From a paper:
To test this hypothesis further, we expressed and purified a second oncogenic mutant, [name]. Unlike the charge inversion of E76K, the [name] mutant form maintains wild-type’s negative charge, but shortening of the side chain disrupts a hydrogen bonding network between residue 76 in the N-SH2 and the PTP residues R265 and S502 (see below). Acquisition of a [1H-15N]-TROSY-HSQC spectrum of FL-[name] reveals a hybrid profile with resonances in the PTP appearing in-between cross peaks for FL-WT and FL-E76K. The convergence of chemical shifts between WT and mutant proteins indicates that both forms close upon inhibitor binding. To confirm this hypothesis, we crystallized both [name] oncogenic driver mutants, E76K and [name], with [name] and indeed found the closed structure of [name]/inhibitor complex nearly identical to the FL-WT1. Using the drug-bound states as the chemical shift for closed, and the PTP domain for open, we find that FL-WT, -[name], and -E76K sample the open, active conformation at 10.4 ± 1.1%, 23.0 ± 3.0%, and 95.8 ± 1.7%, respectively. As predicted from a conformational selection model, FL-[name] has an intermediary IC50 value as it samples a closed population in between WT and E76K. The [name] and E76K mutations increase the basal activity of FL-WT from 5 s−1 to 34 s−1 and 250 s−1 at 500 μM substrate, respectively. By plotting the actual kobs for phosphatase activity instead of percentage inhibition, it is apparent that almost 4.1 μM and >180 μM of [name] is needed to properly inhibit FL-[name] and FL-E76K, respectively, and restore WT activity levels. Strikingly, [name] affinities to all FL-[name] forms correlate well to the corresponding equilibria between open and closed states: FL-WT, -[name], and -C495E are predominantly in the closed conformation with tight affinities for [name]; FL-E76K and -C459S with predominantly open conformations have much weaker affinities.
Author numbering: 2 to 90, 94 to 156, 160 to 235, 245 to 293, 302 to 313, 324 to 528
The structure:
Amino acid sequence: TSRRWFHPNITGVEAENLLLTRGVDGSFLARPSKSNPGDFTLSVRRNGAVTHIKIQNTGDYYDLYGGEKFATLADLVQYYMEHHGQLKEDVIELKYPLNCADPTSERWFHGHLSGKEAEKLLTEKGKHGSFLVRESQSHPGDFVLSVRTGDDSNDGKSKVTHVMIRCQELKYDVGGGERFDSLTDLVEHYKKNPMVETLGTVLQLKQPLNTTRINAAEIESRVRELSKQGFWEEFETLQQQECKLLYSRKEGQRQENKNKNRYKNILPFDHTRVVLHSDYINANIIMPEKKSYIATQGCLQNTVNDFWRMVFQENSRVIVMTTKEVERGKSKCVKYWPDEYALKEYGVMRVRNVKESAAHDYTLRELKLSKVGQGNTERTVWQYHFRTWPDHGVPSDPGGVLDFLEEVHHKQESIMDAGPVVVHCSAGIGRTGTFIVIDILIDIIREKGVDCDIDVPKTIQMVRSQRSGMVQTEAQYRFIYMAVQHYIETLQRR
Ligand SMILES: CC1(N)CCN(c2cnc(-c3cccc(Cl)c3Cl)c(N)n2)CC1
């Protein structure tokens, strides 16, 4: 629960020299692979030298070359830090995190801000405990910590306080006392032991100032601002918080459930998993914080029957399939529906394919699900199979996805008693999280209009607290922004 071992702005050479001059045998760090965008590299020191292990994320999961697949870098690191003797060349041990000092991935670091801007933002958007750290324009190389204190203006009950931070010999201080190795160490220190002014005011550092909430109508401008690197800084800052979602996943780790996971390490949270009324399926309920989703994996051969038990149990009437049955040569989902016009039984569940409708970007399958033994349990389940998603990367234009979800939305709305919408791909976190986050953001705009606030990272973080790894890559993070922008332009044209 730390994640100081990730260095977002480090070359392969610098990582080698940091392990050799400030590390020891066992010291490790992770960095984004500059060789290919979207990849990563685990750099470990061993026997007086540096070994680089490749981690690939094409959009579905983190693939540790020579290792196992994970939903987050945090789980990857924790897995091998606790299972000493799994990563091998001769076992290669992860012992000591080489902590990063870069604050460019901290939610509260706004190097650009000035004095007035910091006060204006903290005044207009901030509440009690809202703080931020910026670089001082007065003293080149120093920083300033701004904090708003008071009660939730124009009365004096609240105020803003500026606390200078001096950077001397690679370490930071507030003018006296202890000196910290980085701004993060300084901040985390005063989040526990807040400063106390001479007259009693406690400079509490509750939450960082929110700068990612925007008005939907003004999405076009925020997109341009994030393009000359902004997306990357904002996305890795979201990744920096993944270590705050280390929730219980005991049920998926039982022996009797191990073979129900397409990837043993990608598991559902206990507190949001779908419990079947034998009870286990790798799926989670996603509740936006009326319409909910079930984010789940692609069916294994031995989980098709459980999959339909879930669909029936939850009264789901729509399935969003976002992957071909095979991609890049490897399987991603077992065909769990019968051929057109055919009827087939999956355990106690019975499925008829009434008719298939081919579209440009997807295939629709009108399915009639029922329970064997009782001829009053029949309901129509509409499977929307999106088939035009590239094996590598993301769509170049979001119109296909948006038209796809627009149709999926209206079907769901036309069924009164409908339960959660089932969305799945390979591991059910990458594309599945992308489709679900876009659907959530689009829902808000369609209801409240373009004059509403939306917050992309906050929405992804809220979804990640219900299933780990939702939305996997920066390409998918950027594509979400583009889909929202495209949808906004449609509304403004009509
Ligand atoms: C410029 C900067 N150094 C990087 C971008 N920026 C921010 C701010 N806030 C979030 C955020 C918002 C809601 C939930 C979560 Cl979990 C997060 Cl992390 C974020 N992802 N980036 C500010 C500082």
